[PDB]
Amino acid sequence: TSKKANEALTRNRELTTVLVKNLPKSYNQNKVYKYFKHCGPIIHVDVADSLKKNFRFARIEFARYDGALAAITKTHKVVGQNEIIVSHLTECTLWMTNFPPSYTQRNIRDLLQDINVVALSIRLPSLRFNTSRRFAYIDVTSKEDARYCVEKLNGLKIEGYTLVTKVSNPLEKSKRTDSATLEGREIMIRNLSTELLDENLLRESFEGFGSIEKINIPAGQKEHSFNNCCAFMVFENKDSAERALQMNRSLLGNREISVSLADKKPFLERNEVKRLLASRNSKELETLICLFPLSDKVSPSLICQFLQEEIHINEKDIRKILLVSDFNGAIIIFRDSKFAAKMLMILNGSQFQGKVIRSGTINDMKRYYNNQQMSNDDFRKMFLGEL
Amino acid sequence: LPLYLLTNAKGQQMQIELKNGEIIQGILTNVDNWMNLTLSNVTEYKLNEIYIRGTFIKFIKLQDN
Amino acid sequence: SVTTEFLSDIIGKTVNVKLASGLLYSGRLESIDGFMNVALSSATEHYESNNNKLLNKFNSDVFLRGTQVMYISEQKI
Amino acid sequence: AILDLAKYKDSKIRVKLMGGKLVIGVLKGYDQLMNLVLDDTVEYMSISKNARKLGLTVIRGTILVSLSSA
Amino acid sequence: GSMETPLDLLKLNLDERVYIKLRGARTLVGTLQAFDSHCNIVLSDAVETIYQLNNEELSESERRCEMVFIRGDTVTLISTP
Amino acid sequence: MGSMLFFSFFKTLVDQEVVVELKNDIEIKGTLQSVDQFLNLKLDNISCTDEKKYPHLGSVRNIFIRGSTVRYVYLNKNMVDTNLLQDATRREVMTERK
Amino acid sequence: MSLPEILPLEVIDKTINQKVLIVLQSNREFEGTLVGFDDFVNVILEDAVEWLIDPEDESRNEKVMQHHGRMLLSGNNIAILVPGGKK
Amino acid sequence: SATLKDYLNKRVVIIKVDGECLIASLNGFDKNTNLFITNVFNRKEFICKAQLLRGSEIALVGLIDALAPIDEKKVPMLKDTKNKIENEHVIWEKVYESKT
RNA sequence: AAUUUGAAACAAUACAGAGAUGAUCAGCGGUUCCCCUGCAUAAGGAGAACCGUUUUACAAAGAGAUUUGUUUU
Secondary structure, X not given: OOOOOHHHHHHHHHHOEEEEEEEXXXXXXXXXXXXXXXXXXXXXEEEEEOOOOOEXXXXXXXXXXXXXXXXHOOOOOEEOOEEOEEEEOOOOEEEEEOOOOXXXXXXXXXXXXXXXXXXXXXXXXXXXXXXXXXXXXXXXOOHHHHXXXXXXXXXXXXXXXXXXXXXXXXXXXXOOOOHHHHOOOEEEEEEXXXXXXXXXXXXXXXXXXXXXEEEEOOOOOOOOOOOOEEEEEEEOOHHHHHHHHXXXXXXXXXXXXXXXXXXXXXXXXXXXXXXXXXXOOOOOHHHXXXXXXXXXXXXXXXXXXXXXXXXXXXXXXXXXXXXXXXXXXXXXXXXXXXXXXXXXXXXXXXXXXXEEOEEEOHHHHHHHHHHHOXXXXXXXXXXXXXX | OHHHHHXXXXXXXXXXXXXXXXXXXXXXXXXXXXXXXXXXXXXXXOOXXXXXXXXXXXXXXXXXX | OHHHHHHHOOOOOEEEEEEOOOEEEXXXXXXXXXXXXXXXXXXXXXXXXXXXXXXXXXXXXXXXOHHHEEEEEEOOO | OOOOHHHHOOOEEEEEEOOOOEEEEEXXXXXXXXXXXXXXXXXXXXXXXXXXXXXXXXXXXXXXXXXXXX | OOOXXXXXXXXXXXXXXXXXXXXXXXXXXXXXEEEOOOOOEEEEEEEEEEEEEEOOEEEEEEEEEEEEXXXXXHEEEEEOO | OOOOHHHHHHHHHOOOEEEEEEOOOOXXXXXXXXXXXXXXXXXXXXXXXXXXXXXXXXXXXXXXXXXHHEEEEEEOHHHOOHHHHHHHHHHHHHXXXX | OOOOOOOHHHHHHOXXXXXXXXXXXXXXEEEEEEEEEOXXXXXXXXXXXXXXXXXXXXXXXXXXXXXOOEEEEOHHHEEEEEEOXXX | OOOOOOOOOOEEEEEEOOXXXXXXXXXXXXXXXXXXXXEEEOOOOEOOOOEEEOHHHEEEEEEEOOXXXXXXXXXXXXXXXXXXXXXXXXXXXXXXXXXX
């Protein structure tokens, strides 16, 4: 069995993380560092304002437990003229999901602010391996604040999205709505004819392999009279789907179909990006630009949103936005090469998330990344002398 | 493709007109990726070798071969 | 380094800037960069020497291309 | 890269240079960028009457256009 | 404090009429719309002036144009008219 | 590395009629078809302007031009947003030296 | 036995604070005290003499200017460095 | 993208910076426009077949259609890319006194 | 080891931290290299980069080979 030493790694997190309460208004992140760096090597420091802005909180993630203990010995010391308190940060962490795709850290801080909850730390995930990732861990200042956030924020509708707010505990994680695809139970059937795009016929043709949970036929295939149609079929267990792959290269009706396990989206996007990065054509590449350098936490919705709110680009001018974290950048694919060229001109040197970014072609993005990674006689005499 | 042709051209007779309108007549013995040369048995317009800085080349007349 | 310290302690002094073409510019060095681009206020233009016939007197800042610059020197005369 | 100056490391060479200058002298040393140290240097401008003596010199590798034996 | 580079100071002249002296005894005057670190320039409402020597008398001719790109390598100096 | 500005500028003028005047005094009317990182120009359906005094071509409809031989590129005011050029320029000089 | 080598940039280093003559590609030279240089052999000279040089007769040389203070002489056109200066 | 692909193995007119035209066939090229060309002749006795032209010296490549039509010889003779006039300073002092 | 089209990637986006990943950004075989545990040597530790090899549904069409100090006079 694989065991839950998740409780191990979470205990490590709390155990080596401290909360410092009641630092002076004038105390910044740097001064927190100087005050505590004698306690032990520090991994991270967060500072947050109090509710009435009269003092500050700090979160310090220490490398090792002895450092957290040393930090806690500072409880009831006096800083400036403020008496601080140092304690382990515990049962003060939320996991939040399904905020709107365009919410930023500031939006989340302000969300908690609206109900008079100070947020000490908001931690967003890397989009390296899945561009769609969207959740957050939030450390607040008390166990009560955590319970209040769950009571008030779980189920709240924000921009049409039903928010999820939970007291953080990874063991309680929900089963995803796409888990069937993630689990390898969903097959994709390709190269069906229009005559064959029929749920009943597919059930008779595939149900021998195992119980079918679901059949999805993408819309628009009959209406646009496609030569080739696709369908997706989810089986209740992995063994059934695997055995159903034997229908590959087999005859169905009067057509020859392909059948394979459905790939997941992050995989498909990376293969699209891999295809793009190796390209030597030019009609497609000349319609896209790159922005760099960017945090691997920046989602396409934020980049699209940035183009709309800061650059005033029309939604339908953007064909696609793809992340390229191996070069710390992002690709924006537009509708014509002239518009792309003009966006290239407008965007280079602009500010995003408070930092100046540059635009350019793919090779430009790669290059930037790689680059960041006395008497004549006297003189004659010494030499002559050696000879 | 051109520097490739010079690489294989190793051992050919050649005439090199430089920016200074001087001529060199010799037998290519080495080029590099920057187009510098060394050539065997040479006429300036007497020498056995010569090194020619590629930036100072106007063009090279090769053999019809 | 010796060069960057030179650029630091010649800001504001009067200089002569000679181009490769032999044109000579005199005036107060308002700005200089690493590429030897120059901005000069009150620039006179002579050929080769300040003692020759005056070609131009300039009334605003003149910018000069570093790629064309042969030398820059302090004027003490 | 292509020419090992060591074979030329102590004889008189003929060096043509970019601005028209011709220089002859004994090769004392060199680097990868083809900067050279020459002794007994003579500088010719563009025959024999156009001759200046310079003694010990360094020719900048950046303006070298051709090198040969002398 | 800090360091205005000559390029930065020249960008202070953006949208204004400038005087450019070019290689080959030629000068332009126009309204500076753009330039880069190579001194490539886009001038609007420009006026080129070509100066020549007939034996011992100075003669000139002029061209005028709406919008003109200028390759930096021909530029010897920039100032104001 | 930098530049970019005029490269992007020219990418906006592809399919516009321009006149390229060269260091050799030759003037060429043509349709911009492509540009590269060195600002080499490929012009389609060319004709020598000023005068066909420079007949040396005649039987030439599309030319490649080495960026380093260009002296002037004449354009029309209709073709350019002078706001984008001034804004982009202030951002770019800022970029090349920082 | 094998007596050591001379490296050009090392010679130029050994010329700092001595007199030097810097000859350009054209018929022009600057004599002065070498203050320092950079990677590209841009040179800082102090109280430099600027000469135009007659090819036939070294006496009919022309002193273009006596410089005072320091000059930065761009290493673009620099053909030859002579430590100790002329003769 | 602007490559010299379309011009491969087709007849071409080359203008070199010296101000010399060339009729040729462009067999090869690199990303420095170093021209590998064959069956070159002026504009008009055949000089040769097979030469390397160095990109630095190329001003202009033009794509031609048929080799005849055309020939010429009473033309002011085209210049070079350099504009080394002569006594530019003389011209500038003339302009100074002209503005006085 | 390539591109374009048939060709529709569905299923409400989100649904558990660099605590993420399918060569998706990998495993394995090798080469070289940046420091430590240390006098040495020698376990082993933190690994980086290049080169072999292990993965890819079907069809058709046309065919990308450009390959990682010459362009700021």
